[PDB]
């Protein structure tokens, strides 16, 4: 891990930006994945899956 250490951990200012980037990108990656599991576990039960949606007289 020392090659990684030499680019990011040497200065705290970079290492702080590394933690902010990982907070951003890590949070987005979990958001997408949790939503994909929810879609796959609830097939057909969504609002866009109402067959007569838009056809109320």
């Amino acid at each position: 891990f020392e090659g990684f250490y030499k680019l990011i951990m040497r200065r705290n200012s970079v290492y702080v930006t590394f933690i902010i980037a990982g907070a951003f990108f890590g949070e987005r990656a979990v958001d997408y994945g949790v939503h994909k599991l929810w879609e796959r576990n609830n097939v057909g039960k969504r609002y866009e899956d109402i067959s007569v949606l838009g056809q109320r007289p």
């Binding site: 200012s13 930006t17 902010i20 980037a21 907070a23």
Partner: peptide, 28 residues
């Protein structure tokens, strides 16, 4: 000649943080 580098590196940290707390992608 490092104080200018520490300033530039902490400004990048400040800019990344600002884009992170407020996420104005719809406004850019």
């Amino acid at each position: 000649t490092i104080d200018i580098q520490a300033a530039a590196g902490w400004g990048i940290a400040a800019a990344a943080g600002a884009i992170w707390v407020v996420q104005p992608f719809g406004w850019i």
